[PDB]
Symmetry: C2
Subunit: 295 residues, 2 copies
């Protein structure tokens, strides 16, 4: 629909991103950080597509603070900020790696540079694999491993990950064809570890999924609120940490989870605890070139 | 449409597959082999979906003989046989690894076992990732690496690789949902190498793609032949070696290649030249279980 909305989300996400890079100074508490970003996005004119992700070093992604996290930045950390905005369901998913209180290095360069290459070739008509390979070369020609299980994704109205991915590697059969009006989030992750990530507890981000009559009353209602307040967008436990006792909240979520009403999206950590750089922009696949909502 | 056709394709491919395993005896010339299989498929009632693939050891796949290959099997080889049949476009892609003149081992077991698991969970409703994970565990718990760039694919009428894949790894965002009536080819590849494949020349298989006003004369006729007899389905170079002398043939292809008419699918070889075992069956995603065309 309104390409302007995909643009607005993109525009907000840009500004907020920029500012986050700034608040990203040593000792800065992750929790303050997130809150600021979310409310900014808010007062700026839009709701978040998903809770800001502030992932540090080996924590690949899927990490968001919660009312209680004492964690603060530390000089030399590889902080990764992945933000997403949405105007009525039109997402903008951008992200950047900041070496806390320091300047970028070869790793960070590899991810950024990679990401860039992908854009230069995206244009209606090309097969996904081309971006894939592009990304792979930049990362590997710099001696770095690209992650093989975290990757770009195609966005759709009120659907963050709509089905088609954009690997950071070259898989010879990825032959989906970038159509016109296509909206894609390109996001190469680079690492010095093995190049793969595993899920490790706790589960901070969750996803609403399906109506499933639950017996335990409270749970059911917790869900109902969920339905109506977040929708199809993934949300944070931190976002509900005050709508009921920390204790009783848990179960409700679990029961909801053990019921398949909502899916939990645990923290993603590089297998051999390798540093993880990352940059992501969102694009709209046009005929001869792509427009970057988050430029 | 006719589930019976998907069944028929499936049925032929089964028989043929079975027989190939037998013809797979030492010193057996790969070229005799392929010919047999293809003609059997033929006389059995159907056309091949793609040229039989006889891939040996570190040759992951995409290898097919050509009029000229002197290559003969050798005791101890890990021959991989990937066959595909199609009834009016309803494919059946099945495949197996045979230790030439020997009995299967841990590797081969891993890939097989892996494949099985995937089926056990396939059923309308699950997310692709579940299968992915499944595969990953069987292959890895046996200390073997799964290939990360070769993987299962969703089949559709006259479209071998229709877009959605089924990774041999767990990528947390593979959330496509197995619908009812879905046809998928699950195919785990296992290897002791690194777990990745690269393209290496030559280019034996090719695939039509789009009508391009070409300048050279014979290519143009070659184009319209490819168009009429092969179609959207991929072909082997071995299938056209009669239609014209070596030299002229090549060029008509090459022009077309450049023309953007037919894409060529080079050989796939495991990077650290590691052994590659593989098994593949095609399924139809039904409500509570899946029907395996190639059982
Ligand atoms: Co993102
Ligand atoms: Co993203
Ligand atoms: Co196959
Ligand atoms: Co296949």
């Amino acid at each position: 629909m309104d390409t302007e909305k995909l643009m607005k989300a993109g525009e907000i996400a840009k500004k907020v991103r920029e500012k986050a890079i700034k608040l990203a100074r040593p000792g800065m508490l992750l929790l303050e950080l997130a809150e600021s970003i979310e409310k900014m996005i808010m007062e700026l004119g839009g709701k978040p597509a998903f809770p800001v992700n502030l992932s540090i070093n080996e924590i690949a992604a899927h990490y968001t603070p919660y009312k209680g996290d004492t964690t603060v930045l530390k000089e030399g950390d590889y902080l990764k900020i992945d933000v997403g905005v949405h105007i009525d369901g039109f997402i903008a998913d951008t992200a950047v790696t900041v070496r806390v209180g320091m300047e970028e290095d070869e790793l960070m360069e590899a991810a950024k540079e990679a990401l860039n290459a992908a854009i230069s070739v995206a244009r209606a008509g090309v097969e996904i694999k081309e971006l894939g390979k592009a990304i792979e070369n930049e990362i590997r020609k710099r001696g770095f491993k690209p992650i093989v299980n975290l990757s770009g994704h195609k966005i759709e109205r009120y659907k963050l990950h709509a089905g088609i991915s954009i690997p950071n590697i070259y898989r010879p059969h990825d032959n989906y064809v970038l159509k016109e009006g296509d909206v894609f989030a390109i996001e190469p992750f680079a690492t010095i570890g093995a190049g793969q990530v595993i899920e490790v507890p706790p589960t901070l981000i969750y996803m609403y999924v399906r109506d499933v009559p639950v017996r335990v009353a409270q749970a059911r209602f917790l869900l109902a609120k969920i339905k109506r307040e977040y929708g199809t967008l993934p949300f944070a436990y931190r976002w509900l940490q005050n709508d009921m006792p920390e204790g009783q909240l848990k179960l409700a979520l679990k029961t909801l989870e053990k019921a398949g009403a909502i899916y939990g999206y645990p923290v993603l950590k590089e297998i051999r605890n390798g540093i993880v750089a990352q940059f992501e922009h969102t694009i709209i696949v046009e005929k001869d070139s792509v427009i970057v909502t988050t430029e």
